[PDB]
């Protein structure tokens, strides 16, 4: 398997080159557990969803904007901003003066759009401003590859989005037939507002840093469904935030359950939590 023709120092050095080619905060690779040089070299880091055949993209004709106070929306005037039309009073932006998701924010974040009259510095464009923390892909003890932040991250800090190939329910069926006995899957259902378009995000071939997030039964980050196209919601952003205070070099983990050979891989859980459920889905 793999590319057994380049040796350790070359394979690893090609991955570091692959990370340095990512725009934004630095992403690193370290391994002090064993001798594996890096994750797969056929993986591609993307800054935006990778659509496929059969997927109806988000139609911009259903997309609206706001007025607000040409520059930056005012955090203390949530009723004026048309982007917050949804949800029940008291209407408030999902973010506080510190740019972190409020503790009373729900599972749905409503951000501004390209239609809005903001200068991109709007406080309601957190996700769209991408990753802000420098991350590190490291090798774990009993799991495969993991991720950990290098700087302290308060509760509510945005980490990054979960990206990958957006595929249809049919497409996912024929990929399952390829997963071997010990295959590793990277799926994430996109089902929170509709169930007709049963789309899914697969990170096996294309994805973001978040592909390496490990499961934990007592996680420290959660998924907030961020929405820009307020019309069609068959596709939306999967935005990770901190639900606890996270210290440097602390492993980032979430719960693989916020709502065929896949469900017959599972494997055993090893998050070291006193409240561990004992099982896992790849
Ligand atoms: C989306 S993740 C991929 C991250 C994985 N660490 C890697 O090498 O890329 C799913 C896989 O990660 C491993 N994994 C993640 N969390 C685990 C956990 N608590 N316990 C055991 N294995 C875990 C499992 O092999 C699982 O199939
Ligand atoms: Zn705005
Ligand atoms: Zn606005
Ligand atoms: Zn807006
Ligand atoms: Zn566990």
Short mmCIF file of C-alpha atoms and ligand atoms in Angstrom, two decimals, residues 140 142-146 162 183-186 211-216 256 266-271 280-282, ligand 1:
data_model
loop_
_atom_site.label_atom_id
_atom_site.label_comp_id
_atom_site.label_asym_id
_atom_site.label_seq_id
_atom_site.Cartn_x
_atom_site.Cartn_y
_atom_site.Cartn_z
CA UNK A 140 -1.34 9.82 19.21
CA UNK A 142 -3.54 4.51 20.73
CA UNK A 143 -5.28 6.40 17.88
CA UNK A 144 -4.02 7.23 14.43
CA UNK A 145 -3.34 10.91 13.80
CA UNK A 146 -4.60 13.76 15.95
CA UNK A 162 -15.14 20.59 8.40
CA UNK A 183 -10.84 1.00 6.74
CA UNK A 184 -11.01 4.52 8.13
CA UNK A 185 -14.03 6.64 7.22
CA UNK A 186 -14.43 10.41 7.41
CA UNK A 211 -10.28 15.51 9.11
CA UNK A 212 -7.80 14.37 11.79
CA UNK A 213 -10.00 15.28 14.78
CA UNK A 214 -10.38 12.27 17.06
CA UNK A 215 -13.54 11.19 18.86
CA UNK A 216 -14.05 11.61 22.58
CA UNK A 256 -19.10 11.70 16.55
CA UNK A 266 -16.58 0.76 14.44
CA UNK A 267 -13.45 -0.19 16.43
CA UNK A 268 -13.01 0.39 20.20
CA UNK A 269 -12.97 3.77 21.95
CA UNK A 270 -9.93 4.94 23.89
CA UNK A 271 -10.53 8.58 24.87
CA UNK A 280 -16.85 4.09 18.30
CA UNK A 281 -17.73 4.62 14.64
CA UNK A 282 -14.80 5.41 12.34
C1 LIG B 1 -12.26 10.81 11.47
S1 LIG B 1 -11.14 9.88 12.35
C2 LIG B 1 -9.56 9.93 11.52
C3 LIG B 1 -8.44 10.40 12.50
C4 LIG B 1 -7.41 9.25 12.72
N1 LIG B 1 -6.79 9.46 13.98
C5 LIG B 1 -6.36 9.23 11.59
O1 LIG B 1 -5.34 8.48 11.68
O2 LIG B 1 -6.51 9.96 10.56
C6 LIG B 1 -11.71 8.29 12.50
C7 LIG B 1 -10.61 7.26 12.93
O3 LIG B 1 -9.80 7.77 13.83
C8 LIG B 1 -9.52 6.67 14.96
N2 LIG B 1 -10.02 7.22 16.24
C9 LIG B 1 -10.45 8.47 16.42
N3 LIG B 1 -10.81 8.60 17.69
C10 LIG B 1 -10.61 7.43 18.30
C11 LIG B 1 -10.81 7.03 19.59
N4 LIG B 1 -11.32 7.65 20.79
N5 LIG B 1 -10.53 5.79 19.95
C12 LIG B 1 -10.04 4.94 19.05
N6 LIG B 1 -9.83 5.33 17.78
C13 LIG B 1 -10.12 6.58 17.41
C14 LIG B 1 -10.15 5.58 14.59
O4 LIG B 1 -9.19 4.65 13.89
C15 LIG B 1 -11.23 6.05 13.62
O5 LIG B 1 -11.52 5.06 12.72
#
